[PDB]
Amino acid sequence: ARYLGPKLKLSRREGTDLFLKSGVRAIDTKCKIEQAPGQHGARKPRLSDYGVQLREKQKVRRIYGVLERQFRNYYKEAARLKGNTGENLLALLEGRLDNVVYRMGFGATRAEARQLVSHKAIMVNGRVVNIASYQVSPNDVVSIREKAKKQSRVKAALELAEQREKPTWLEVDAGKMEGTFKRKPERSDLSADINEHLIVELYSK
Amino acid sequence: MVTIRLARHGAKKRPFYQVVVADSRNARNGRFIERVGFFNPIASEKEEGTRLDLDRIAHWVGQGATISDRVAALIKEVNKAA
Amino acid sequence: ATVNQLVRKPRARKVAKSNVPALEACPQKRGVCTRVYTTTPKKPNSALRKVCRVRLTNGFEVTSYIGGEGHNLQEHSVILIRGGRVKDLPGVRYHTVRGALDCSGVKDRKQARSKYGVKRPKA
Amino acid sequence: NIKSAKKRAIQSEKARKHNASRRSMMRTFIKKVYAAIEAGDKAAAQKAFNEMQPIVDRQAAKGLIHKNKAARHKANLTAQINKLA
Amino acid sequence: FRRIRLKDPLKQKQLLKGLVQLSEEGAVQVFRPISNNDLIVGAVGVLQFDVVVARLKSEYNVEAVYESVNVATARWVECADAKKFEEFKRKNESQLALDGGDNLAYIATSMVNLRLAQERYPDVQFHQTR
RNA sequence: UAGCUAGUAGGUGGGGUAACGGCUCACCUAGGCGACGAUCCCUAGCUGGUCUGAGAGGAUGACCAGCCACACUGGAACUGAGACACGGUCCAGACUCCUACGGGAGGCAGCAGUGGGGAAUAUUGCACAAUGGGCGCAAGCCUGAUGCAGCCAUGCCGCGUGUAUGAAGAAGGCCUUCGGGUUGUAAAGUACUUUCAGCGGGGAGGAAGGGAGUAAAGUUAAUACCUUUGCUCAUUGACGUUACCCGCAGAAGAAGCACCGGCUAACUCCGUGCCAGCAGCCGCGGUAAUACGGAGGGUGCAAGCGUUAAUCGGAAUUACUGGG
């Protein structure tokens, strides 16, 4: 299920910062980014259309931590909704529970947030959910139970939440660790860089 | 002989009965005339637990349908003055 | 065009024959596997390819290409037959399954071991 | 086959004479009236019809005849005996 | 004693099942080497004509006439405790043999190999199965 | 496969069917089907549906459900409202078994299980606790249907096999222009945690009913009997050492499979040398192999991964949409 391997080599492979190794520390520059994905990083590829589509797909997948079959299921759930497919797909990727826990600042990295969800700590609407594939409904409230509240691992990782953009579509209390979910995010609000059009052109065939 | 009985739908360890008018010689999930209402035994307190249209049931009582014990208990659940 | 011709004689779809006559769509077949010898291929190859004439259990006489490096076949040792043409031996339309029945696996293989039936390197 | 409910077999044996024997005597009375049809005597035909009518209605009563076979017998036999008379 | 070499090699499955049925018994314990041929019939007695007559049944049709092949001393069954028999499997991976009941004794060709096995120190929660 | 049909086509009358009916008999005429495929051969249970496909279409219809047909083979009738009958009868045939040899018993295309076939498919398990069916006023009885339990990664889904930190950028392997790089925050070390397994304790829900007693209203001459409704008591679980919750201990028990010339994601070194060999197509190997084998590294999926077999799409290469 999980990758559980070189989460720093993937950002070198894609070139952009995938935020897998975020941590308490800032931008590292400790792995020679953009110039060494591996042994043959000095090579310049031909980089065709299917190439940039597959690199965009793997980039979005290793940002959001979703496997291939599960992301194909998310695309099937994106093509059936209203509006357009590309906005719906990123709304479904944001509607994952671990991504909401990550945007709240409850954990430094995304895998740490997934481990915090999994080990009976994250509770939404009074009902504890361990699997990160929970589709977050609008107008919910996420928090941490009292038996797992502030054993320091939420605490210092919350300080990283003071350095992030702190987006509009969700609000954290930061006094009792009780988040509040709100309306669905606009396309022009989430990270401003990733391309849904290559994902649509890949999964259209 | 016609009867009003449950049909036992659902999954394993997840029962969901279908109160339905059918002949006694037909199968439990077999051929039926028409369906009327439903019952869920695991329907602890939420927005809906049991729908039961008493008009068609009274019509089949006017035809001669033998009501089983669970359907009679559902009739005593859907009480005229309660 | 000329739709009345299709009214009289409808457009009959061609029923293309299968590349492997494997008796009503089965994955594998089990044969007697006689006649173990080497076959020199067609013009731009110039090699010596091992082959075996496999009398199947349904009566058909097929000839399957012996894969792998080394084998223990001598007119016997019932094996398993899989489909697929070889494109190097005209007349051969099948392959031998290694790791299957009596033909044992290929000695000292590490890479590509699910094909050719070799186990994981134990040491 | 060995069965606890084999009693329905031999009891049907107990049926296959007796009821059929009644059926037997029923049709012979019917055939007797056909003898009158081969005789030409309308008085003997009426006497035979009056002899066969209550017994064939009794055979229609006891579940052997579905009172439409015997009704057909009464109908066409009445038609024959008043066509002859 | 000797072997199984499977005359009339069609339908090995009657002996790949039906002799494993006899392998649980006190007289017969079938030994499977890795090379998938030359399966050893275990006998504690001498007269293996019992199994040869037993090979002529409803689910037994293969003959396997005997000859002389030398495998010597009894295959002393031993299954050591965890984290330690793994490297014992790794160092001589061509010198193992499956048994009746999924066991691995060592392999018994001579007394000197059993002395090397005792020199190898296999600390074991020992069960004889015999 | 171009002619087929003689109860054949229709009519009158008799009989027969729960019922129209050449369904069946006596008489009369020569009709009836057919190129908008009659008769003959092969194949096939049909359908709602499944898979694929934008749609139109194509294959399939295994599991759920309706109908039909069958119960070792063929034929026949009786009982019964309903059978021309799975666990009913008789006759004829084939195959096992008993015989005291005069004669009889049997039909797993039921649940289990076995021989053989095949590449391929399970346990000779628990109980009527719940539903339904049969009988009984009822209590109660049967139920291999069912509710489950055991096995199989057969398919889908989820979780874990640790997390954070950690440079001497250690040892070993591989490459080298022998400067160094790669494996590699990977491993060792340190600090926490134990999801899931192991053990020890609580513990729902699937449970409605039914039995005894009491009270009230009907019924009746009757405060007696019986029906119905409150109400009191003892209760009804195969699953079940249940789901779920708490506690103990220790990272402790838990990661493989394919690919690396292009299609299509990923590179070198060594060993042969048109030999061994790979391959789904272009194809490689003839002493400097990014294609064979081994080592290292990377990529992809993940308790699954590759190969084989089948259907559809791509294939507008069956063109009705949509070709010449």
DSSP track, C38-95: EE--STTT---EEEEEEEBTTS-EEEEE--SS----SS---EEEEE---SSSTT--EE
F71 C1' to C91 CA distance, Å: 48
- Are D74 and D60 within 8 A, CB to CB? no
CATH number for A134: 3.10.290.10
Count of domains forming chain A: 2
Question: Comparing C-alpha atoms, which of A197, A191, A205 is closest to residue A57?
Answer: A197
**Closest chain C CA to residue E90:** C123
Say which residue the tokens 């990758």 belong to: A3
Question: E17: left (phi > 0), else alpha (psi -120 to 50), else beta?
Answer: alpha
Q: Facing residues of A142 across strands?
A: A124
Q: Residue C32's CB: how many other CB atoms inside 10 A? A: 19
C34 touches E: beta carbon within 8 Å: no
Angle at A160 between CA A157 and CA A162, to 5 degrees: 125
Cα separation of D53 and E61, whole Å?
78
Contact residues for C91 (Cβ-Cβ < 8 A; gap 6+): C63
- Are C50 and C71 within 8 A, CB to CB? yes
Say which residue the tokens 């919910």 belong to: A140
Are A120 and A174 part of one and the same domain?
yes
* Residue in C78, C104, C122 closest to E9 by CB: C78
F314 C1' to E15 CA distance, Å: 49
Say which nucleotide is closest to residue A205, CA to C1' distance: F314
Host domain of residue A109: 94-181
Furthest CA-CA distance within chain A: 54
- Are E51 and E66 within 8 A, CB to CB? no
Host domain of residue D63: 1-85
Contact residues for A124 (Cβ-Cβ < 8 A; gap 6+): A97, A134, A136, A140, A141, A142, A143
Cα separation of B49 and A153, whole Å?
43
Cα separation of A27 and A22, whole Å?
8
Say which residue the tokens 């497919």 belong to: A85
D58 three-class SS: helix
Contact residues for A114 (Cβ-Cβ < 8 A; gap 6+): A2, A65, A98, A132
Say which nucleotide is closest to residue A70, CA to C1' distance: F157
Q: Residue D63's CB: how many other CB atoms inside 10 A? A: 9
Question: Comparing C-alpha atoms, which of D34, D15, D27 is closest to residue D76?
Answer: D34
- How far separated are the first and last CA of chain E, in Å rounded? 17
Cα separation of A70 and A93, whole Å?
11
Residue B10 parent element (H or E): strand B9-11
Torsion angle in degrees (nearest 10) through CA of B60, B61, B63, B66: 100
Flag whether A2 is in a domain: no
Are A74 and A98 part of one and the same domain?
no
* Residue in C32, C104, C122 closest to E35 by CB: C104
Say which nucleotide is closest to residue D13, CA to C1' distance: F78
B45 three-class SS: coil
Please report which residue ranges of chain E form alpha helices under DSSP H.
Answer: 13-23, 49-54, 85-91, 111-119
Are A194 and A156 part of one and the same domain?
no
Cα separation of C70 and C107, whole Å?
8
Contact flag for C and E (3+ C-beta pairs < 8 Å): yes
Tokens representing A44 are 């310049």
E72 three-class SS: coil
Are A164 and A196 part of one and the same domain?
no
Cα separation of E49 and E63, whole Å?
11
Tokens representing E77 are 């069954």
Chains touching A, CB cut-off 8 Å, 3+ pairs: none
Residue B61 parent element (H or E): helix B54-61
Residue of E5, E7, E10, E92 best to disrupt the C interface, most CBs of C under 10 A: E10
Query: What amino acid is encoded at A174 in this protein?
Result: A
CATH number for A194: 1.10.1050.10
Question: Comparing C-alpha atoms, which of B1, B3, B8, B2 is closest to residue B67?
Answer: B3
D7 in contact with nucleic chain F (CB within 7 A): no
Flag whether A1 is in a domain: no
Are A78 and A126 part of one and the same domain?
no
Cα separation of A22 and E130, whole Å?
61
Say which residue the tokens 């070139």 belong to: A15
Contact residues for D39 (Cβ-Cβ < 8 A; gap 6+): D45
Tell whether the torsion through CA atoms of D70, D74, D80 and D81 is positive or negative. Answer: positive
Are A75 and A114 part of one and the same domain?
no
Concatenated DSSP letters of A31-62:
S-TTT-SSTTTTPPP---HHHHHHHHHHHHHH
- Are E45 and E91 within 8 A, CB to CB? no
Flag whether A53 is in a domain: yes
Experimental approach: cryo-EM
Residue with CA nearest to F286's C1' atom: C46
Tell whether the torsion through CA atoms of A92, A94, A99 and A104 is positive or negative. Answer: negative
Q: Using the beta-carbon criterion (under 8 Å), do C77 and E12 form an inter-chain contact? A: no
CATH number for D69: 1.20.58.110
Domains located in chain C, CATH noted: 1-123 (2.40.50.140)
Q: Residue B28's CB: how many other CB atoms inside 10 A? A: 12
Say which residue the tokens 């293996």 belong to: E48
Torsion angle in degrees (nearest 10) through CA of D6, D12, D17, D20: -160
- Are C77 and C88 within 8 A, CB to CB? no
Query: What amino acid is encoded at B39 in this protein?
Result: F
- Are A21 and A8 within 8 A, CB to CB? yes
Are A35 and A99 part of one and the same domain?
no
What CA–CA distances, in Å, run from B68 to A108, B3, B32, C76? 61, 7, 16, 69
**Gyration radius of chain D over CA positions:** 17
C76 touches E: beta carbon within 8 Å: yes
F312 C1' to C4 CA distance, Å: 30
Q: How far is C35 from chain E (nearest CA, A)?
A: 16
F211 C1' to B82 CA distance, Å: 29
Are A98 and A174 part of one and the same domain?
yes
* Residue in E9, E36, E89 closest to C76 by CB: E9
Domains located in chain E, CATH noted: 1-130 (3.30.70.3280)
Q: Facing residues of B11 across strands?
A: B14
Q: Facing residues of E31 across strands?
A: E40
Q: Is B76 exposed, middle or buried (0-12, 13-18, 19+ CB in 10 A)?
A: exposed
* Residue in C76, C77, C123 closest to E90 by CB: C123
- Are C83 and C95 within 8 A, CB to CB? yes
Cα separation of C100 and C33, whole Å?
14
Count of domains forming chain D: 1
Query: What amino acid is encoded at A154 in this protein?
Result: V
F208 C1' to B15 CA distance, Å: 14
Provide the pairing of β-strand B2-5 with B66-67.
parallel
Cα separation of B4 and B52, whole Å?
12
Distance of CA C94 to the CA centre of its chain: 1
Cα separation of A104 and A141, whole Å?
11
Are A112 and A161 part of one and the same domain?
yes
- Are C71 and C77 within 8 A, CB to CB? no
C102 touches E: beta carbon within 8 Å: yes
Say which residue the tokens 């357009």 belong to: A84
Distance of CA C123 to the CA centre of its chain: 33
Q: Residue C17's CB: how many other CB atoms inside 10 A? A: 7
Are A73 and A124 part of one and the same domain?
no
Flag whether A88 is in a domain: yes
